[PDB]
Design an enzyme around this catalytic site. Structure first.
Site, PDB file in Angstrom:
ATOM      1  N   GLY A  66       0.827  -1.201   0.000  1.00  0.00           N
ATOM      2  CA  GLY A  66       0.000   0.000   0.000  1.00  0.00           C
ATOM      3  C   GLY A  66       0.864   1.256   0.000  1.00  0.00           C
ATOM      4  O   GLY A  66       2.029   1.221  -0.398  1.00  0.00           O
ATOM      5  N   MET A  67       0.287   2.366   0.449  1.00  0.00           N
ATOM      6  CA  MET A  67       1.014   3.628   0.496  1.00  0.00           C
ATOM      7  C   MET A  67       2.091   3.586   1.576  1.00  0.00           C
ATOM      8  O   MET A  67       1.842   3.938   2.729  1.00  0.00           O
ATOM      9  CB  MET A  67       0.046   4.778   0.783  1.00  0.00           C
ATOM     10  CG  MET A  67      -0.855   5.002  -0.433  1.00  0.00           C
ATOM     11  SD  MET A  67      -2.048   6.313  -0.066  1.00  0.00           S
ATOM     12  CE  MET A  67      -0.872   7.688  -0.032  1.00  0.00           C
ATOM     13  N   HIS A  68       3.288   3.153   1.193  1.00  0.00           N
ATOM     14  CA  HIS A  68       4.396   3.069   2.138  1.00  0.00           C
ATOM     15  C   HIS A  68       4.027   2.175   3.318  1.00  0.00           C
ATOM     16  O   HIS A  68       3.435   1.111   3.140  1.00  0.00           O
ATOM     17  CB  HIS A  68       4.755   4.466   2.649  1.00  0.00           C
ATOM     18  CG  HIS A  68       4.913   5.401   1.481  1.00  0.00           C
ATOM     19  ND1 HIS A  68       3.833   6.051   0.904  1.00  0.00           N
ATOM     20  CD2 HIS A  68       6.017   5.808   0.773  1.00  0.00           C
ATOM     21  CE1 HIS A  68       4.306   6.806  -0.105  1.00  0.00           C
ATOM     22  NE2 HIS A  68       5.631   6.694  -0.228  1.00  0.00           N
ATOM     23  N   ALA A  69       4.382   2.614   4.520  1.00  0.00           N
ATOM     24  CA  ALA A  69       4.082   1.845   5.723  1.00  0.00           C
ATOM     25  C   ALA A  69       2.894   2.451   6.463  1.00  0.00           C
ATOM     26  O   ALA A  69       2.551   2.020   7.564  1.00  0.00           O
ATOM     27  CB  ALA A  69       5.303   1.820   6.644  1.00  0.00           C
ATOM     28  N   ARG A  70       2.270   3.453   5.852  1.00  0.00           N
ATOM     29  CA  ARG A  70       1.121   4.111   6.463  1.00  0.00           C
ATOM     30  C   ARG A  70       0.030   3.095   6.782  1.00  0.00           C
ATOM     31  O   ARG A  70      -0.494   3.059   7.895  1.00  0.00           O
ATOM     32  CB  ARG A  70       0.567   5.177   5.517  1.00  0.00           C
ATOM     33  CG  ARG A  70       0.984   6.564   6.010  1.00  0.00           C
ATOM     34  CD  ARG A  70       0.138   6.950   7.224  1.00  0.00           C
ATOM     35  NE  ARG A  70       0.609   8.210   7.789  1.00  0.00           N
ATOM     36  CZ  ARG A  70       0.279   9.374   7.240  1.00  0.00           C
ATOM     37  NH1 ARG A  70      -0.479   9.404   6.178  1.00  0.00           N
ATOM     38  NH2 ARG A  70       0.713  10.488   7.764  1.00  0.00           N
TER      39      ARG A  70
END
Length: 85
Positions: A14-18
């Site tokens: 997904g969006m980085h580790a967010r």
């Protein structure tokens, strides 16, 4: 009962580790327990930092997200929506 869903990791959970970090916040906002699992059968408990690190290596692998609770759907849907970008 519990609710899970298979999600293919296209070299990006997904969006980085967010997503992983957000999950912790979602688990508190929603009423249900979320659990991640890799095709290898490795349970990447969303409640464990060590598990999140293992998922990172799942770049291109399939996982099985499981969620239990009244909002189990929301938690799972939220995670799936994040993984799908």
């Amino acid at each position: 009962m519990t609710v899970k869903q298979t999600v293919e990791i296209t070299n990006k959970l997904g969006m980085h580790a967010r997503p992983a970090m957000k999950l912790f916040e979602l688990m508190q906002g929603f009423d249900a327990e979320v659990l991640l699992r890799n095709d290898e059968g490795t349970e990447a408990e969303a409640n464990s930092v060590i598990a999140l690190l293992m998922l990172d290596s799942a770049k291109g692998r399939q996982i099985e997200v499981e969620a239990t609770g009244p909002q189990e759907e929301e938690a799972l849907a939220a995670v799936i929506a994040l993984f799908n970008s």
